[PDB]
Each structure stands twice: as C-alpha cells, then as structure tokens.
Write a protein that binds this ligand. Structure first.
Ligand SMILES: Nc1ncnc2c1ncn2[C@@H]1O[C@H](COP(=O)(O)OP(=O)(O)O)[C@@H](O)[C@H]1O
Lengths: 374, 115, 280, 294, 60
C-alpha cells in the first residue's frame, strides 16, 4: 500500500500502457508489436538481436516483419505475450515484478481458458505476489465519475458496447461488433489504391495508420459531403511521406471512418455502431432506459475522430423515442481512460481484499481467478 | 398608391353606412326599452337580447379601430417605397446621360487629331 | 425475423410540403393502422382510415394502394383531394389509385365535424351488415356504441344521385353507419373517439354473433330498453395514450405527444467530479 | 442470445406474442430489496401474485383493454385492498405499480405511478368486499363467449361436469343505472350468503375467492364451461336436443407440501411463465419440476 | 389576383359550411312544449327561424 504501489498495466490490442497506481500519468505507452528480421545481416560487429519488441521494433520498420500478438481481441501467440510483458516490466519501468502487485484489464466477453492462461503466466513465471483482472469497459465509467451508464469502447481489436448499472455489467446486453481501427486502416489502403498509391508491406501499414490518425474526419451528412467534395478542391490536403513524396488524400478523408456507420462498405452484413448501441439499450429493462439515454460515455482509440460526437448524437436521436433526453459525454482523454480507471480502482483501501495471494493460487490452480473474481 | 387610394375611398364610404347603422341601432334600443317598460319581456320569440347587440357593436368597433391602423401602416410603407425609388430614377437618368455623352465624345476619337 | 418498422420517418425524409399540424396527424393515422393491423382486423389495403387535415384546405390523408397495413409508415401516406386528384405524394413508388376514397368523399361532403372515418371489413361486422334487423343491443358494449344509421349499398357511389341518398340516410347527427353487406363505418371528430367506437362496436358484434348462434332466436335472449338505458377526459383520449405508451415501450417511434408524464423520475445520486455532459 | 427484440406475430392475435415480448423486458417482480417502510412480506408476496395474475389474464386474452378491474385484499387489520391504477395496460402492470386503497376508494398508497385509480370502478368490488368478510380476491372478466352466455335467458346449464363443479351461480340483473348504495344492497341480495361464481348480466363474469388460486380456478372453470355451452346450445335449438347432467347424483358419485384444490393450475402456469422469463419470484410448492441428475 | 380571390373563396365558404352543419344540429333535435300555448309558441319560433334562414340564402 504505502511502501509499494500496484502496477497498472493496460494491455490494449494496439498499444500497451504501464504505470504506478495513484499516479495521474502512465509511465510508458508503446506499440504492442514484435518484429523479426527478414534480410541477411552481413555487418559482423554492429550487433543484431533475434527479435525487436516495442518502440525499438517500430524504429527499424524497414528490415522487420511486424507481428501483432493480440488478434481481434484474442491472443494468438502466448510466448510473444511473454516477450511483451518482459519488455514492459524490465525495460520500460525497470522494476521487478515480484515486489509489487499487478493489475490486468480484459475484454468484457473472453474465453475462460484465456483468463486461466493469463493467471498461470502471471503467477508461474513472473512470480507476482498479487494480481487482479478487470473488465476494460467498466473502468472507463469509474474514470468518468459515474456508476450508471452505457459505455461504448472501440480499439484496434474489436468494438463493444456494454451497459453498467451501479457497477454491474449486464451479461445479456453486452454487444460485440468487428469494426476496429485495423479494418479502417485496411479499407484506407483499399480506397487509396484508386488514386494511384500502392502500399502492400507491413511496414507501410504504420504509414497508412499515421495518415488515418492525422487526416480524417467524420461527415455530418454523407450525401451532401460527397457533392461538396466533387464540386471543389478545398477539402483536399497533402501529406508528406517518409521518403519525401507528397500525396493528396482529397475525397477519402470522410470515406475511411464511414465504414463504422455503414458496415456494408467492408462487406460485413452487420448493422452500424449506432444501431448496435440502440439495440444494446433496447435489450435492457424499461426502468433503466431513461438513465441510459440520458447518460452515454464514449471511449476507445477509434472514438477520437473529429466530428464523431455530433454525428453520434444525431444518429442516436434518429432512433430514440420522442422527447427523449439524449446526451453524449466524451472526455478529451477518452483513450487513456482505462488506465486512469485502473489506477483509481487500485488506489482504494477497500480494494485490497480483491488481491489473490500466491498461496491461494498454489492451492487452487489457475481456475481460482473465476471464483475469486466474478 | 391607386389600390390603397380606392381602398381609402371605400373605407370612408363605409363610415357613411356606419352612421346609418348606429342610427338604426339606437332606434332599436329605444324600441327595446319601450318593450321592456311594459311587463318586462327579455326576448319573447328571438335569441337576440340587448347586450348581445352591444357586444357585437363593440366588437365591430374594435376591428375597424385596428384596421384603420393596418391601412395606415400599409399606405405609409407604400409611399416610403416610391420615395427612394423615384429618388433613384433621376440619379439613374443622369448617370445614363453623362456616361453616354462622355463615352460618345471619347468614341469619336477626335482628341488625337486636333492636338 | 422482425416486422418492426419505425413509424416516424419524418426526420429521415426532410422533404415534401406540409401543413402546420399535418406531421402529427400523419403519425396518428399511421399508429391507427398499426393498431388495426395488430388486432388482426385487417391485413390488405382497402382504404380503411381517412383523415381530414384542415377545415379549409381539405387535402385528406389516405394510405397508398398496395401497401399492407403492417408496412405503412408516416412518410408513406398520400395527401389527396376530395375528387381523387393527387395533392401530394410521399415516398412510396406505387401506382396511385383513389377509387376507395370515393366512399369517404361524400361523407366529407356531408358532415364537416368528422375528421376521422374508419371503414371495416371484418367477418363479424360484415355478418352484422348482412343481419337484416341490424345490431340488437343485447350487450353493454352495443349500448355504449350509441345510435346507428342503416344505408343500402350497391357497391358504387361515383353516381351523382347515389351521394344524395347516402347523405340522406346518414342523417344530421349520427356517427355510426352500417352499409348493408359491406361491413361498418365509424365516424369521429378525433381519431381517438373513432378508434374507441370501432373497438366497442367490434366487441359488440362479436358478442352478438355468438348470442344469435347460441340462442337460435330473439325470444331466447333479453334486451334492455333503449329508453331505460337512455378531470374531463375525451371519449378516446385516455385509452389511446396507454396504447401509444405501450408501443413506445416495445420500441415503435410513435410521435404521439403525451399530455401528462408517466413516471415521477426521482432525482438520482449526483457526484461533483462528473465531466459536464453533452457535446454542445 | 440469438433472440429477436420483438417476437414475430401470428396471422391472428398479435396481442399474445406482443405481450410476450413486452414481458420479456419488464419483470413483474419489480421489488429487488429497496426501502419499503410500509410493505410486509405477505403484502409484497401478494403484490407479486396479483401482478402475475394480471399478466396471466392479459396473456390468455381474457381482457377488454382497461375497463375490467381485479382487486385483492392485503388482509391487514383494516381495509387496504390492492387494485391496478386506472390507465395502465395489463402487460404494463408490475408489483410496485399496484395501488393500495381503502374500502370506499381512498388512496392510502399512491404507489410508483402518478396515475390515480378509478373511483367509479371500485364500488362494484366494494359491494362484494362489504358483503363478505370471507372473500379476499375479486376478479371481473369479459370474454365474448361469457357475454353470450350471460345474454341468454336460461343462463348456465348443467351440461358439463365443470359446470357441476362450479356449483350454485349467483345472477345479477343488468340495471345499467349504477344507483350506488341500493345497488350494493341488491348485489348483496343476489350474491347471497355463500356463492362462488357471480354473473353480472350482459356485462361480465365475476369470480370471488378466499385466495388468488381459488378465484383463478373458479373463473377458468366458468369460462371453459361457458364456451362448452356456446357450441352445443347453438346446435341443439331446444331442450328436446340437449342432455342435461343431474347435479346431485354426479356430485354424490364423484365424491404442507400437499396442493390445495386450485393451486395446481396456478403453479403449472407459474412454472410456464417463469420459463418464459417473467421472473415472478412466486414461492413454488416444489422448487424443481424433476429430480436433479446424479 | 385570381389566386387571391380563390383563397378568399375558400375562407368565405368555410363559414357557410360550418353554419349549414350548425343548423343541421339544431333542427335535428325536437322538443315540443306541452299543450296548445307552448305548441304554438314553438310554431312561431320555427317561423322566426325560417325567416332568419332566408337572410343567408342571399349570401349563399
Ligand atoms: N489521435 C488519434 N486520432 C485518430 N485516431 C487515433 C488517435 N489515437 C489513436 N487512434 C486510433 O486508435 C487505435 C488505438 O486504439 P487503442 O486505444 O490502442 O485500443 P485499446 O483500447 O485496445 O488500447 C489506433 O489504431 C488508431 O488508429
């Protein structure tokens, strides 16, 4: 407590954040990538590792095959996650894992074996004293100052909407949808090939992601905006590539995020995000509908596109009943909020009963996490 | 002006009929008071009483009182619309005169010969 | 997997030419279609409910031909004239037929105090329409209906003289008309009163059919005398709000405005560290 | 999971599936353990039972909008009858939405809803409540077959063993005037000292019971016997074409975890309704339908 | 000008149609007074109404 602070480690699908509990800012945020060399190294004395992890891997993008250990919110390479956790504990923070508790976040709906494997890895090798698993979407509402409301989360893995009612996650009304930032980046490639610019390797995917981050916005009205873009060239902007070339994105700036609202562009038969949130509220009982319409919180990396707030408000107004209290509450720091909620939750004195001791794990195997943490 | 001309004329034509109307109305109220003096009939075979007639008379007076101001506003706006228009007309005509005369003198091109 | 369609399509349309109170009447008659579809009375479009928008401008709202009552929405309604000419067409790519409006047109020419006319073709009401002495008030609901007028129907009313006989047989003050062999027609100043009378007369007809079957004769039944039978809420105001509220709870985007709130909404438990809400 | 928001409707009678979809959302056991300074365990349990009875009455179609009322007794030391508030539909009724009023109609508990109760509609139940201290549950129902049975001269006929199980039937003639206190006196006269089923002519069918299960049993037997009579009296056309069962001979020959005489149907339909997802919280006589696997 | 006078036609016919409805409503009900004095009083009231309607026949 006083002597040692619990480690708050947020394992997002695209980025990984780490810091100490009770602190405002995470100490280290880095991409969750692992790269392996693809070319023969002929310089004898310059020093080449077998694999590069994190920011060191992203510095040398040209000579590596970048691989993501987390795929669609599901871990597909567990020793790769051992590497990313080793890099987090030893290099970024320079603290031993055996002397501090750790806090882990997770998707609202994950397989049981995934939780068991995380617990087994965290106790067996790192020998951490105490650990706890929390739902990613719950901690955002704690960071919001709220205990009742609907939380929409969208990262690089998957986009899900949950309702929370005085700290209770309703399991039936949690809805999932496969519209993440990675799919938007792939669609950005697919629409960039029209102008004449071709990107094909995993190195250029980071360039396309940076283009998506820096030059995109959400149209309030799609049909008017297409006519506006066809009429004039005032919407066009120029981006300057790492090799010195200059591209003109032009029309596609409001075509990249539009796959969120109309998933038929990507070939998916599912409904839009607004319909997903509307159906998520529709599945709950009547009594809590009024405080779900009157209380909506946006979170996640994808939700920082400019103009997403007004478009979201209009699209959820179009589906809501008449004279209904509708408001969207989007904090400016909405994709650092999960770490903030984790540090807040670890800061409390009544939270210290949540910790799982080493003796408890040694007695009850890796299956104790589900009984101890509901 | 001419529509609002003739509408002012038939408004003061309507006041002459209003004089006949109030003469008939006070004749009727005197006859009704004469009827009311003997054994007090209110209205033996008709819905109409004195106070209903007074009410509709006041109502008509209120509406003509409003409509005289309405016509005053209309005629004021119409005359205010011609005044700046016919100010504009003479300035436009002087504009035409000077521009055609000066451009015709320069169109002759005799300045380069006589010097 | 669902029949559920948002009954309010006024915001997504953002077009057309509307009156100052038209967009509420559209939603109200669309809701009337939804209720008559849900009870199983009608499924196939035969120009059942007609509404007058304004006393002076006429421009009566009817359903398009070809769209079943389940699929009718607010923007799909068609504003026609008294003769059958198209005043305004909504977003409905269907051929326009105003033949069924002719049944309501002379009633519009007869009584102005009615705005809503509801015609039925249910088997019970059509059996009562074929029932030669008409509705026998042997039940409480038939007593609640009121007085009736009976009119012979030859199936056509384009003729200039048939209209005179229709408005003769309707009478000056009668809000229920029974056409022989052609079901029933209900007449109301508001859609609420007309819907209430439709429901009550349908229940009375359903009672009467079973009664005439089971008794086998008039003498086996009892009939209470019409002379013996002989804040403020309007005749259909109270029930129709409950129906609209229940459809709102299910999820239909009913545009009907509620006169009084449902729940008290006790003030919730407030924290100061809230981010201030809304997107402004 | 994998279930539509609203259930697809039948060609006829969309009210059944529609109220099913509404009950999927709204639980009838609205109470979850909040503060209740006036509630008792028996009062809360009877509130849940009454809400479930309202939803079951809506589910079979034994309902004519909101013009019928069902009242129960809290069985406190003074008055306190529970009634639905005036205005809410039967599929909207929850446990906390029910309104406790007095015998003369004074609202002692306004409940969770702002809608007041109908003062005129409670006098019919108040006449029965003042008539008998034994009665505790009064159900007023309106089905078309029952209305057709009430509209005929002869009334109910002993043609089925279920009508014989009904026993003596009190008949109340349609005055149609609502003359208040003498109307109450005439109800007391026609109902008699002991009776199970009342038929209020040309308007409705009334069941009275010491418990909710008893009233449900009586009204179910009455409705089913009425719709038995409807077809056969139509086809007969006279006494020369109808066999009448002898009441006395048939009744003489025919006659804790243990069930009551009317708890079986109530518990079976409660099992059905909880399998639907209404989560009524009713105390079952046996918690499981079958033995747990070993 | 002709569209203006058509809209005046609509506004003028509105009152006429409402009045036709209103005297339809009041001639619909029948309540004769008891005995010959009240009967003939109702008769002369009817003649008053009949003389009243001929005034608006001109407006029609
Ligand atoms: N400033 C920004 N502008 C636009 N998009 C951004 C921005 N920052 C992050 N993103 C998008 O968010 C994604 C990262 O989401 P992240 O918050 O890491 O997900 P998780 O919740 O799994 O941690 C990136 O793919 C990127 O496209």
């Amino acid at each position: 407590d006083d002597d040692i602070a619990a480690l708050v480690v947020d394992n997002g699908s695209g980025m990984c954040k780490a810091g100490f509990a009770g602190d405002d800012a995470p100490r280290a945020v880095f991409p969750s990538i692992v790269g392996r060399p693809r070319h023969q190294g002929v310089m004898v004395g310059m020093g080449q590792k077998d694999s590069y992890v994190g920011d060191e891997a992203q510095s040398k993008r040209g000579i590596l095959t970048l691989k993501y250990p987390i795929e669609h919110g599901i871990v597909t390479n567990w020793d790769d996650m051992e590497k990313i956790w080793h890099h987090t504990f030893y290099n970024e923070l320079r603290v031993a894992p055996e002397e501090h508790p750790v806090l882990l976040t997770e998707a609202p709906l994950n397989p049981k074996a995934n939780r068991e494997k995380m617990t087994q890895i965290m106790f067996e090798t790192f020998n951490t004293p105490a650990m706890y698993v929390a739902i990613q979407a719950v901690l955002s509402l704690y960071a919001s100052g709220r205990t009742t409301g609907i939380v929409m989360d969208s990262g690089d893995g998957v986009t899900h909407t949950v309702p929370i009612y005085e700290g209770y996650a309703l399991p039936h009304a949690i809805l999932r949808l496969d519209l993440a930032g990675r799919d938007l980046t792939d669609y950005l490639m697919k629409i960039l090939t029209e102008r004449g610019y071709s990107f094909t390797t995993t190195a250029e995917r980071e360039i396309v992601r940076d283009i998506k981050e820096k030059l995109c916005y959400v149209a309030l009205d799609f049909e008017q905006e297409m006519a506006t873009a066809a009429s004039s060239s005032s919407l066009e902007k120029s981006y300057e590539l790492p090799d010195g070339q200059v591209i003109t994105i032009g029309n596609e700036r409001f075509r990249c995020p539009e796959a969120l609202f109309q998933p038929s562009f990507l070939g998916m038969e599912s409904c839009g995000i607004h319909e997903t949130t509307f159906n998520s509220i529709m599945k709950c009982d009547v009594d809590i509908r009024k405080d779900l319409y009157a209380n909506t919180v946006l979170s996640g990396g994808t939700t920082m596109y400019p103009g997403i707030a007004d478009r979201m408000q209009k699209e959820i107004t179009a589906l809501a009943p008449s004279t209904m209290k509708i408001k969207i509450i989007a904090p400016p720091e909405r994709k650092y909020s999960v770490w903030i909620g984790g540090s807040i939750l670890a800061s409390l004195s009544t939270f210290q009963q949540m910790w799982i001791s080493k003796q408890e794990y040694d007695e009850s195997g890796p299956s104790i996490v589900h009984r101890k943490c509901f | 002006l001419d529509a609002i001309r003739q509408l002012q004329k038939d408004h003061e034509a309507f006041l002459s009929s209003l004089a006949r109307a109030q003469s008939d109305f006070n004749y009727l109220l005197e006859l009704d008071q004469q009827i009311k003096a003997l054994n007090v009939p209110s209205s033996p075979y008709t819905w109409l009483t004195v106070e209903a007639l007074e009410r509709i008379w006041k109502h008509l007076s209120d509406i003509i009182k409003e409509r005289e101001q309405e016509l005053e506003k209309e005629e004021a706006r119409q005359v205010k619309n011609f005044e700046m228009c016919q100010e504009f007309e003479q300035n436009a005509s002087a504009f035409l005169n000077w521009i055609l005369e000066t451009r015709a003198y320069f169109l002759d091109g005799s300045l380069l010969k006589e010097t | 997997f669902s029949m559920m369609t948002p009954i309010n399509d006024l915001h997504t349309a953002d077009s057309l030419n509307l009156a100052k109170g038209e967009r509420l009447m559209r939603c109200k008659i669309s809701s009337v279609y939804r209720l008559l579809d849900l009870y199983g009375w009608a499924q196939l479009s035969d120009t059942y409910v007609t509404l007058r928008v304004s006393k002076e401008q006429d421009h009566f709202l009817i359903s398009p031909k070809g769209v079943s009552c389940s699929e009718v929405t607010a923007s799909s309604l068609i504003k026609v004239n008294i003769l059958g000419e198209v005043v305004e067409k909504g977003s409905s790519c269907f051929p326009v037929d105003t033949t069924g409006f002719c049944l309501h047109s002379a009633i519009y020419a007869a009584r102005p105090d009615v705005r809503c006319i509801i015609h039925l073709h249910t088997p019970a009401t059509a059996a009562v329409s074929a029932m030669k002495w008409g509705l026998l008030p042997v039940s409480h609901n038939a007593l609640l209906v009121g007085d009736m007028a009976y009119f012979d129907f030859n199936g056509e009313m384009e003729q200039e003289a048939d209209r005179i006989n229709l408005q003769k047989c309707l009478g000056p003050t009668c809000k229920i008309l029974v056409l022989r062999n052609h079901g029933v027609v209900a007449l109301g100043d508001t859609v609420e009163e007309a819907f209430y009378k439709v429901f009550h007369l349908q229940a009375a007809c359903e009672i009467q059919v079973s009664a005439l079957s089971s008794a086998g004769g008039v003498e086996n039944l009892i009939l209470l005398e019409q002379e013996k039978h002989r804040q403020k809420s309007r005749l259909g105001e109270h029930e129709f709000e409950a129906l609209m509220r229940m459809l709102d709870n299910l999820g239909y985007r009913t545009g009907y405005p509620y006169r009084y709130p449902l729940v008290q909404e006790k003030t919730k438990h407030k924290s100061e560290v809230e981010i201030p809400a809304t997107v402004t | 999971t994998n279930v539509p928001n609203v259930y697809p409707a039948a060609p006829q009678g969309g009210m059944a599936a529609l109220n099913m979809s509404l009950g999927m959302v709204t639980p009838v056991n609205d109470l979850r353990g909040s503060d209740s300074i006036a509630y008792d365990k028996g009062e809360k349990l009877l509130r849940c039972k009454l809400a479930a009875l309202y939803r079951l009455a809506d589910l079979f179609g034994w309902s004519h909008l909101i013009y019928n009322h069902i009242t129960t007794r809290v069985s406190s030391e003074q008055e306190h009858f529970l009634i639905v508030p005036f205005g809410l539909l039967y599929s909207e009724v929850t446990a906390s939405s029910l309104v406790k009023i007095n015998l003369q109609g004074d609202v002692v508990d306004r409940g969770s809803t702002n809608l007041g109760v109908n003062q005129a509609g409670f006098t019919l139940h108040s006449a029965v409540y003042a008539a008998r201290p034994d009665v505790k549950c009064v159900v007023h129902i309106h089905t078309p077959a029952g209305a057709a049975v009430s509209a005929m001269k002869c009334g109910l006929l002993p043609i089925s063993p279920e009508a014989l199980s009904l026993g003596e039937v009190a008949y109340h003639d349609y005055h149609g005037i609502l003359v208040d206190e003498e109307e109450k006196v005439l109800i007391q006269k026609n109902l008699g000292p002991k009776s199970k089923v009342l038929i209020l002519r040309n308007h409705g069918l009334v069941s009275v019971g010491e418990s909710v299960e008893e009233a449900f049993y009586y009204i179910h037997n009455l409705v089913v016997a009425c719709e038995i009579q409807v077809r056969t009296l139509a086809s007969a056309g006279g006494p020369d074409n109808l066999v009448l069962l002898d009441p006395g001979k048939y009744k003489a020959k025919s006659r804790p975890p243990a069930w009551q005489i009317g708890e079986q149907e109530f518990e079976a339909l409660m099992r059905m309704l909880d399998n639907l997802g209404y989560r009524t919280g009713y105390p079952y006589r046996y918690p499981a339908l079958r033995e747990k696997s070993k | 000008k002709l569209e203006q006078l058509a809209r005046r036609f609509d506004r003028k016919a509105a009152m006429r149609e409402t009045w036709l409805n209103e005297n339809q409503r009041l001639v619909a009900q029948d309540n004769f007074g008891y005995d010959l004095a009240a009967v003939e009083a109702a008769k002369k009231k009817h003649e008053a109404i009949e003389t009243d309607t001929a005034a608006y026949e001109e407006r029609v």
